[PDB]
């Protein structure tokens, strides 16, 4: 796989941010870094 | 671990103990860079950027640069 | 005075046991069984090898000189070689400066008799130094 | 102390005024 | 683990300690000499001041105010 | 007769006096944290909120000590 | 009608200097466009290597400027005032003498307020020249 | 008299151009309270209460590029002048105050007359109004004075301590080879601890002072905001 | 914000990343300039300027 | 769609920003600039010599 | 992001790919087992 | 005899003495925030209202320090 | 012998000493508001009355501060 | 007449005054610990978070004492 | 005219002032032990941990006292 | 001109200042013996342990008192 | 020039300074009694025990006052 960047996060944890619901949650329970 | 104020990030576990115990580890598939992987020293086997260039060599290079900066005028002084 | 010595010995023993080098552990075990010193033996082995490799160094020096003079070294020149050459030049300069300082046996150039700074030499607090 | 000085205060403040009127729009956009 | 047949490490430590003690002796001697010379220079300056004061006093008497 | 005298060393005295202002500031800061500890033990659920208010108070109190320290530098360097 | 108020009015082609610009953007993006590179108000990044690289460089160029442009003025003033009060008088000295004087100035700088005061206060009885030597 | 000089941000401007030619998210802000003025829902304000956000962010960026990087030796705070900071704070504070005054709503100032009708109007309430009107300008002055003094004192202390450390390190390191090496080692360790402590304190204090600088302006704005309730 | 990045475990690992290589070079410069000043400014042959009492910054700023 | 920051060129956006977004601030800044250049733009020879 | 392909991956990027790649479960299990063993030895 | 003397470094002393007044202001501010922290933990629901009164005291307490600070300048620069 | 001396610079010292009186006024104000915050949390239903009394206390302390400043200004000028 | 005087020993006086600034600093630190004990006694499970805050308060208070101490040593060597 | 004066009794005055700072330290000790007793009564089970923390507070406060005391002795013999 | 002056009676003033250091020491003792009564009344069963700690605090404060007393006497007979 | 001066009225000033130490002694005594009343009014059956401890505290603080009084007398008669 390549070395390219992805959707920026700003150094934030999406499982505790104020807009966490906007980030989908996967099976493991970790909210995505992007929509 | 820490190097001054720089702390090494650690990945949070995602698997439960029950699921984790069922995982079969096969280091044969792992890259040669990361074998016997240790969280406290993950870059022990990491390749050098320049072959034969040690950290001490760069430290000594900087020390020599400082010595030159401070002593060049002693050997080749110039008039105002 | 004794507790500190015991603590230092224990720490060194723990660190010695910690290392996972098969050769180092094997040598340590052999020397402990024989009661000899591993570090001194390593030093003697290194000195013997260097003594037996002097003419190898000479031959390598001549081979490298031929390689450089022939122009083959510059044919495959890369950025890494440039970095190494810059390191080499820096060491040459610092060694030259140190050699000059040692040659004149003084950090600063000596003062000529006709210079106006001679007074400073006369007014030394301690003439011995 | 220059920080308490005023003999070239106007030229000194031109830096802030340039930053406010010319550099802030660029940073904004 | 048999008894050591050689005492190389202790000898090396003793070598270092002996060199350090010699360094301390030399440093003490040099410091004492420096203090002596500093005191001597101070005395020389004091004597020069006294001589200048005496010369000024003689010149004042010659002035005769 | 009219005599004008300019004593240089007085600037040290004024500088030392300003430093005394730090005694109140240093004490005042300790008072804030003393209440912070006695408050976190009365309602630990707000410890993070209280810690934030304590820091704000520290700076305001600290700010005053700087005013005095500025005068010390002004006279010490003039 | 003379000049457009819209940024859409292009002055060059889309492919003008594409390659160099792509190289520049590659340099910019490789270390900065990362999840762990979260800035504090755009000024303090999260990548450690950015600090490790930029702090030494900033210090180096600032120190070079200070040593070769700012402190040089004080050094030259000391040399001129202590050895004639004129530039030609200083130039009458040799390079080694100037080196000695400048290193003494560095000594004075290092001592500052925490050192012996005989470097600038003449003890009574000293035979060295005073302030009225050149007057 | 016209002096031509330059700020000490050219390398930082170059870095900003290099690293911000492409977009990046911002999630950490020194003064976040400028974005969240209202905490109870259904409350809204007809006044442009979010006008300060852009100026707040730009001021934070500018003052952080100067002050935080000033901890690096020989880095210059080009704007460090008392009256220049006075000009900056005057601009911001007086601009917002004149925005409130141009509204031509005199009732907005009713709260200046402190107290209730029970208190004597002339001898108590009027004096309190005088004091509060004075206190607004005093708040402006205190803001700018605090910002100036913090930097000045911190950098003076850093310079003096660094000078002392250089002196002892250069002219007394030979004690390592002498019999009094323990004293020198203790002093050196203390100096290292002091160095680290001072750097941490300055780093924290710069950010906190910027926070307070923006909070004073936001408090000025909030003192005259009135919130309506949705129905 | 100090969130992450390469962090050498010990000195020997500083050569595993160019940025840390430059950092260790700079640290070497920083720490080695002090011994140089010790040697240069505590030298036996270093002599104070004879005319050091002719002028000083203390009189000038006073 | 049209946005001032994305569609307008820099001078136009600057004028719009300081005329319909922060006009009072610009007015105060101009006032202060005039004051500075009217009362703080002189330096005597003695002042130059001193500082 | 083709223009970045020439830069490759540094040590930290390789570590992240190794830990969070398809082998992430194996690495997590190995790391947790090693940490548990070290903690038990410490106690 | 009539003798007039003008000692030209005394304004330093007066400036330092005025600066000492800042100790009380700093202490009072610390007392205010100490009471604030120990009061919020008792009635958290009214935390915001208390903060407003705390700032009011700071506004009415920092002002006094300015008068003393004002006198310092009037004597330091004269 | 009878000698009369007139020192010009002694009014600075008197002005500084008078300014020190504000340290008590500043601390007194801090005490007033510190208790006000505590009282409001205890009985928040009486916030307005307590605020009114606190203001009255601040006014009286401020009046004393005015008297001290009056002496300071008089000595500074006269 | 123009008379310039330079008093040497005044630097001792100014240095002593700055040392007084450590009185409040020492008192302030003692206050923090005293409040810490009460908080621990009234909430024994928080023996670490309170301890950390006490250290933070000491550090800030120590910093103020060190700002004054720099002047105390500096004037002593001026 | 340039006049240099050296008063040899002002190295006593500075020494006395540096000793005043000890009061802020000595009082600080009493405060820590003044509240230690209350804490022990409140929570006798923690007679040990509180005592250790009090010792830490006393030592740190004493550290300030000795920093001031160093200035006191230096100016006494110099 | 170089003028050396030796004022003899200033050794008294330095002695008096060091005595002020006892003000805090004496007050600090009162604080210990003030809280001791409250602690004893609250928990009379622990009088012995509290009394021992009170003595400990008194000894520590007295140490500082002797330090100031030492300086006063040295500057008195010197 | 070497000039030796002996001022005879200075010993009065040093005496007054030592008397100030009594302020920190008398106040400390009042603090003990103030806490004694509260301790007595909490559990009055222990009055006979508390009173003895109260006397002990007065016996120590008063002893400190003697040292200051001693200096006030030595300098007042020497
Ligand atoms: C102005 C001009 C003046 C000119 C004067 C004349 C000049 C000389 C002319 C010639 C004269 C005749 C020849 C004489 C030769 C003498 C030397 C010699 O032959 O040595 C061989 C000899 C070993 O020979 P061997 O026994 O046959 O070896 C058998 C095997 O080969 C062993 O093999 P190996 O495997 O062991 O190999 C390693 C071995 C071999 O390595 C070497 O060969 C080393 C280099 C040899 C030459 C050394 C010359 C020294 C001369 C003086 C110093 C000059 C600078 C030297 C720089 C050396 C840099 C490495 O390494 C060592 O020797 C180690 C020594 C260091 C031990 C360090 C331990 C310190 C512990 C401290 C603990 C403290 C705890 C306190 C707790 C208190 C609690 C209350 O080694 C030594 O004698 C070593 C001496 C080292 C002295 C160092 C002194 C430094 C200054 C003092 C310290 C100040 C800083 C630190 C202070 C810290 C606070 C305390
Ligand atoms: C008499 C001697 C000469 C002097 C005469 C002066 C006359 C004065 C009249 C009376 C004025 C009274 C009032 C004065 C108040 C001063 C206050 C003050 O200074 O405050 C500090 C304050 C400092 O602000 P700052 O925070 O440092 O930021 C301002 C910086 O400029 C950076 O801010 P920024 O980065 O935000 O700026 C935007 C920047 C955005 O970034 C960039 O664009 C990057 C570039 C930056 C350039 C500007 C920085 C300059 C750096 C230093 C100089 C660079 C090297 C120059 C080499 C000179 C060699 C001799 O873009 C630009 O700068 C746009 C210009 C770009 C020019 C590009 C030219 C390319 C030519 C290519 C030719 C190729 C030919 C090929 C042919 C082939 C044939 C085969 O200054 C200002 O705010 C500006 C003051 C200006 C006042 C107006 C003065 C009148 C205009 C004078 C023009 C003279 C032109 C003739 C000179 C000829 C050579 C001798
Ligand atoms: C369909 C046609 C197809 C044609 C295909 C052609 C293909 C082949 C290429 C054609 C040939 C090349 C064309 C030009 C390329 C230029 C570079 C480029 O590509 O730029 C990117 C870009 C390419 O265009 P685009 O992306 O397609 O479209 C642009 C957007 O539509 C709108 O852009 P924007 O609005 O977003 O931004 C525009 C501008 C914002 O707008 C402006 O700045 C425009 C207004 C500026 C006014 C400044 C002067 C004001 C003075 C005061 C007023 C005076 C009034 C006087 C009245 C009369 C008095 C009598 O933005 C900036 O300022 C940032 C960019 C700055 C660039 C950096 C400049 C410095 C580079 C230095 C490099 C060399 C260093 C030294 C090397 C030394 C080696 C030894 O071009 C620009 O952004 C244009 C920048 C223009 C800057 C002008 C600055 C002038 C400063 C010097 C003035 C000298 C006056 C002397 C007076 C003397 C009196 C005595
Ligand atoms: C052709 C142009 C227009 C001609 C005139 C048209 C018809 C009249 C227009 C309106 C006139 C208003 C009259 C006064 C109204 C009341 C206000 C007042 O009291 O005014 C006092 C005084 C006027 O005196 P006065 O009351 O008429 O009576 C004379 C008294 O005897 C004097 O008594 P005093 O004691 O007050 O005298 C002290 C001193 C007092 O003088 C001052 O205080 C000067 C203050 C200047 C204020 C400038 C306002 C605009 C600021 C924009 C933002 C800049 C940010 C910072 C940038 C820094 C880096 C450049 O007075 C003077 O000497 C006046 C000289 C004024 C010269 C104005 C030159 C402006 C240059 C702007 C440069 C901008 C560079 C940007 C580069 C960007 C490149 C990317 O100052 C002003 O009025 C200043 C504002 C003038 C505005 C003129 C119209 C706009 C500008 C047109 C020229 C643009 C040139 C661009 C060059 C670019 C080179 C690269
Ligand atoms: C969010 C918090 C950020 C915290 C960052 C912490 C950084 C930790 C640094 C550890 C030590 C680094 C040593 C570097 C040595 C360099 C070479 C040298 O000689 O320097 C000596 C210099 C000075 O050392 P000196 O004073 O001993 O120098 C002696 C020199 N003589 C004798 C001639 C006087 O070192 C420094 O000044 C380093 C201070 C660093 C303080 C922290 C600064 C943080 C703010 C800037 C961040 C920049 C990030 C930019 C990123 C991009 C933005 C878009
Ligand atoms: C070493 C000494 C140190 C001393 C330090 C002293 C402090 C210095 C602090 C400097 C930095 C802080 C500055 C903050 C800003 C201060 C502002 C200030 O006071 O400026 C006042 C000054 C007053 O201006 P002035 O000084 O020219 O006043 C003229 C008055 N006469 C003619 C009587 C002398 O403002 C200006 O300088 C700007 C004037 C032009 C802009 C305004 C024009 C419109 C005026 C409207 C009313 C009159 C006209 C009729 C209505 C309109 C009709 C069209
Ligand atoms: C308005 C002029 C009226 C009088 C006639 C003058 C003609 C002078 C001869 C000009 C020959 C070269 C013309 C080259 C094409 C110019 C095209 C142009 O104007 O583009 C403007 C373009 C900017 O475009 P945008 O803002 O992105 O938007 C454009 C679309 N809305 O500007 C540029 O790039 C600069 C181009 C400058 C070209 C030269 C203009 C010279 C004008 C001189 C006028 C004065 C009279 C001259 C008389 C000359 C007699 C011999
Ligand atoms: C040709 C070089 C040979 C090297 C051999 C060195 C042997 C030295 C052994 C004794 C050393 C201690 C001596 C103690 C007395 C020194 C006094 C002094 O300063 O004298 C200087 C000599 O000092 C120097 O020049 C050297 C100073 C120190 C040099 C440091 C060397 C490098 C240290 C690296 C440190 C890096 C960190 C290591 C940490 C390890 C310990 C924790 C000469 O001048 P003087 O005539 O005395 O008077 C000058 C006044 N006009």
Residue numbers in the entry:
A (entry chain n): 18 to 52
B (entry chain p): 26 to 105
C (entry chain m): 16 to 144
D (entry chain c): 29 to 57
E (entry chain L): 4 to 68
F (entry chain P1), L (entry chain Q1), M (entry chain R1), N (entry chain O1), O (entry chain X1), P (entry chain W1), ...: 41 to 118
G (entry chain f): 2 to 136
H (entry chain a): 1 to 231
What does the paper say about this structure?
Mitochondrial ATP synthase consists of the soluble F1 and membrane-bound Fo subcomplexes and occurs in dimers that assemble into oligomers to induce the formation of inner-membrane folds, called cristae. Dissociation of ATP synthase dimers into monomers results in the loss of native cristae architecture and impairs mitochondrial function. Here, we report cryo-EM structures of the intact ATP synthase dimer from Trypanosoma brucei in ten different rotational states. Although overall dimer architecture varies among eukaryotes, we find that subunit-g together with subunit-e form an ancestral oligomerization motif, which is shared between the trypanosomal and mammalian lineages.
To describe the conformational space of the T. brucei ATP synthase, we resolved ten distinct rotary substates, which were refined to 3.5–4.3 Å resolution. The three main states (1–3) result from three ~120° rotation steps of the rotor relatively to the static Fo. We identified five (1a–1e), four (2a–2d), and one classes of the respective main states. The rotor positions of the rotational states 1a, 2a, and 3 are related by steps of 117°, 136°, and 107°, respectively. Throughout all the identified substeps of the rotational state 1 (classes 1a to 1e) the rotor turns by ~33°, which corresponds approximately to the advancement by one subunit-c of the c10-ring. While rotating along with the rotor, the F1 headpiece lags behind, advancing by only ~13°. However, due to its large, rigid peripheral stalk, the Polytomella ATP synthase mainly displays rotational substeps, whereas the Trypanosoma F1 also displays a tilting motion of ~8° revealed by rotary states 1a and 1b. Within the four classes of the state 2 the rotor advances by 23° and F1 returns close to its position observed in class 1a, where it is found also in the only observed class of the state 3. In all classes F1 is in a similar conformation, corresponding to the catalytic dwell, observed previously also in the crystal structure of T. brucei F1-ATPase13.
